Design a binder for this molecule. Structure first.
Ligand SMILES: CSc1ccccc1-c1ccc(C(=O)N(C)CC2(F)CCCCC2)c(S(C)(=O)=O)c1
Length: 178
């Protein structure tokens, strides 16, 4: 129930808090040991938990960030090199990036029109239903987007990115909310 970030998966540009509930962009590619699970080309990290069934929920503070990506991914997603975050490649995510532009990771991408920019985002997974939904905590829990008919067959993982290094313009953390 209590999501924790998995240091073995974390790109070396990421700083994880000791309690593994916060991740942020660092200023220098750290010199952490290597291992097959680590995202080597993007500032990405997984939650340690693996879901095979059930409903599951977590919540992330994004206050003060100009860019981030949140969602769920297959355990089997590739870790090394470059790739696109498509449902075919095993990703169900939403993101914030450019001039305050929110998008859902469909092909083609789906612009999301959020009158109230979220300070916290809820992520709700229902394995058996094939559903991942995103809630705008700041706008009283309004539905941002839902992926349906996901037809999961393998284990799933919480997926996070605090954005891209931009010169300290995006050092605010993602924080998992109790
Ligand atoms: C470090 S992740 C991050 C962190 C903060 C904000 C944004 C992102 C981020 C979102 C989507 C992509 C991506 O896959 N695309 C845009 C392609 C596509 F639209 C192609 C059509 C299917 C959906 C995905 C990428 S990426 C891997 O290209 O850098 C990065």
């Amino acid at each position: 129930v209590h999501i924790t970030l998995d240091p073995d998966t974390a790109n070396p540009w990421l700083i994880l808090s000791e309690d593994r509930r916060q991740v942020r962009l660092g200023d220098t590619q750290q010199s952490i040991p290597g291992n097959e699970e680590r995202f080597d080309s993007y500032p990405m990290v997984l939650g340690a938990q693996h879901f095979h069934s059930g409903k599951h929920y977590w919540e992330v503070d994004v206050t003060g960030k100009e860019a981030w990506d949140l969602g769920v991914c297959r355990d089997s997603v590739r870790r090394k090199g470059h790739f696109l975050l498509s449902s075919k490649s095993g990703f169900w995510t939403i993101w914030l990036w450019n001039k305050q532009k929110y998008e859902a990771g469909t092909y083609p991408q789906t612009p999301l029109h959020l009158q109230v920019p979220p300070c916290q985002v809820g992520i709700f997974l229902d394995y058996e239903a094939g559903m991942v939904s995103f809630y705008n905590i700041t706008d009283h829990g309004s539905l941002i987007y839902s992926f349906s008919e996901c037809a999961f067959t393998g284990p799933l993982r919480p997926f996070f990115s605090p954005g891209f290094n931009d010169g300290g313009k995006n050092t605010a953390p993602l924080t998992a909310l109790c």
